[PDB]
Amino acid sequence: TFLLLEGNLKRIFATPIGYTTFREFQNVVFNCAQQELANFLFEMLINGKLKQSAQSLIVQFMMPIRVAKDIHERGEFINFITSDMLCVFLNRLSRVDGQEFLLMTDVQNTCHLIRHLLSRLLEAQKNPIGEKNLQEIQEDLDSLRAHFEELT
Amino acid sequence: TFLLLEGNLKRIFATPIGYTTFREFQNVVFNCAQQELANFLFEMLINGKLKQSAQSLIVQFMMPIRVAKDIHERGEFINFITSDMLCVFLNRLSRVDGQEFLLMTDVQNTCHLIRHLLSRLLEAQKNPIGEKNLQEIQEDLDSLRAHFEELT
Amino acid sequence: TFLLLEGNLKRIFATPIGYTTFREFQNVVFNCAQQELANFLFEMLINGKLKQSAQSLIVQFMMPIRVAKDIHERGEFINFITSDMLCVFLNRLSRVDGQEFLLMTDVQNTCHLIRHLLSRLLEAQKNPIGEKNLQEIQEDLDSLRAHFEELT
């Protein structure tokens, strides 16, 4: 039974993780199961929480399974950005789901982008959640104020 | 000859404009040509500058031809952004070439994005071109400073 | 003013319609405006509802504007499907937003696909809206029952 889970996991993780991959993983566990075994196995493979073979399954697959779960939840969120100056800037956006987008900006575009993003933070102030969220990062804003004026 | 140019243009603009489309347009003009006619026709169809049939060619195709040329030059530049607040924000980026990318951000991500973009403007100050570019938009920065502190 | 709207519309519709295109259209109208003019112009260009020049704007752009609005609302909905039998079937799915996906199925896959889709209709019966929705198409289901048994 342990071997079959490994083979099925090797198969599903052989291709790029996507938005169906976490549910597809759940289907493999359910196929192998017995509700009591599934819950044991979810704990084992997602959390590494409880034979030698089990340690092997955690090492190969816990991180890929957790990323599948992350993608299910927030795959479309920004994950990383790089920039190269050439005057224009070559920006690369990468999402939690691994997809990337190339975007060129000149100095005027970048400033306009900043203003757009600020307008959204200003709109957050009107919503009860957002205002508290901004206060949660009050120091990061304050850093911005120093940092931006220093540019000026 | 005028009719053939129209048919060839209808064909090439029947599919999405891409990065080969402007050169493909040039090939249609060269195929129809005689260097003296090509230059006349480039002026006619790109600039609308110099029978009834010619006006028809300008109306249908000048804008699609100019967009093809724009894309050739700067298709990968940012062109537009939209945002929807849900606390997270659903952002959509659109480039000059018409391609779009969906990107989710929460309030912390947005602030971090702002800081990254500012760092690039700060790096521009070190390059001789960028510093003058920033001075060219000195008011847009100054607006930012007001606008950001008002948030704080 | 009428000419500028046309040029701006020719530009934005020169590239593929996407999820930002309807808001980008709104921005063109607002840029041209005066709240009273915008509302007049939205009525004119979306609904064709109220000089010669205005008729021209409706003819070229009302349908592309309405599709942009449709995509904004339901671009990801199924719009069309084709199938070619080769035993396997070459299926092509097209969405409201114009994007397509190729999917191969054999006879067993197709039956399994049907069962999956039925399970969802069965789940709809548990939700108050879905049960009434199914009753709204009670004849289409009844047709299915005849149609499927006739196959058997």
Place this chain on the structure above:
Amino acid sequence: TFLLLEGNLKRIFATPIGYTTFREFQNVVFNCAQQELANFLFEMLINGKLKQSAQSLIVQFMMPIRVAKDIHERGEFINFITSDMLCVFLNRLSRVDGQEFLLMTDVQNTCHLIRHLLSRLLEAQKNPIGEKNLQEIQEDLDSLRAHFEELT
């Protein structure tokens, strides 16, 4: 020689598996080869069939190699579908090649999709292969008939 095969395999499997990957794998084996060795090595790495090092090559690469071969043969076939009810349904299609497509359907669309898929099974009845194929799954159809009428 064993080490070189591993390095070359690590390289080719470092990027997403695609439709060229299986032939690219064959090229690595041929590059390392001697027809007699290639056939031994194909048996070893695809089937795990026949030193310690060989077991290592099977464990890391047999499944990725078999998936590459599967994709070569049927990468465009449906592999998985998920659905989320919101009344509309958020469906995700995943193919053997790992590519996915998002498709929204309401209750009417889903029924129409079912009818389309049934029409294809009905067309299969006209082709000599398809009729026997449907008879091969005669129970799955019969299950459908119960299952659909129970909905009604």
Place this chain on the structure above:
Amino acid sequence: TFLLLEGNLKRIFATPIGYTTFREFQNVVFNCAQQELANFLFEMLINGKLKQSAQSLIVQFMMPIRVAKDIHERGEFINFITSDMLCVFLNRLSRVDGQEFLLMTDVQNTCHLIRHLLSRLLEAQKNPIGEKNLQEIQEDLDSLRAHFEELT
């Protein structure tokens, strides 16, 4: 009836042409129809062959309909290539369906690409059709021989 065909065509051509678009066009004609009218209308709109309104339908839609049909038949065929020298070359491939691909090559890659393509022409010589095909373009090959040796 003529107006409805125009509206339906404006809608379907509002989004990028794809592989379902030609069949989707056929569905619009069939929806409007009467077998005798459909055949008249196919002749009218695909071939421009047989009131004022009909001429309008040919002008707006014949070329987009013919491209849809071309794509149905050979959308994946190469349509155009551009190259920019930078020593490396920036190549852009465009297909009949309008999709493009960027591919970088250095001088060695380009020669290797040529050899690969020649091997395929050499394989064509073994197939009865291909040998005659090569003879059909015997002059284009002969031009190559001059042209390549002149490089050497």
Place this chain on the structure above:
Amino acid sequence: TFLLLEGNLKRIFATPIGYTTFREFQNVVFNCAQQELANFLFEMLINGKLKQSAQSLIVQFMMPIRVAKDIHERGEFINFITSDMLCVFLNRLSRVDGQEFLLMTDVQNTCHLIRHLLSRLLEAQKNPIGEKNLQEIQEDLDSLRAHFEELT
């Protein structure tokens, strides 16, 4: 500290390698660092050059890290091509970055493609670098001349 690097690397390599991945890897090393440790760790993980744990990090990640670096440098370069004869040819292009493109060609297209690629080699002769590059592969060209005439 060694364990954290492994976990962070498992995470970033869980998704497809892209153009941001190498810089994202650098960020993980810098986050873990101390300039002296980073340089040690870059040598360790990119070059395998200098406890048991370190060998484990090289085995799992050196190749994926080197591919990320390759992609950063030349991800858009051609990496592989396959062809299937059907008279038309089904070609598949694969880049260093793993992305692929399907392109159909008939016998005439293939010859035209060859001519285009030769024109670029002929243009290279005008540039000081390219002429020497062609001389570097003088034998590969000479092979072409034999090989092409033999076809004729």
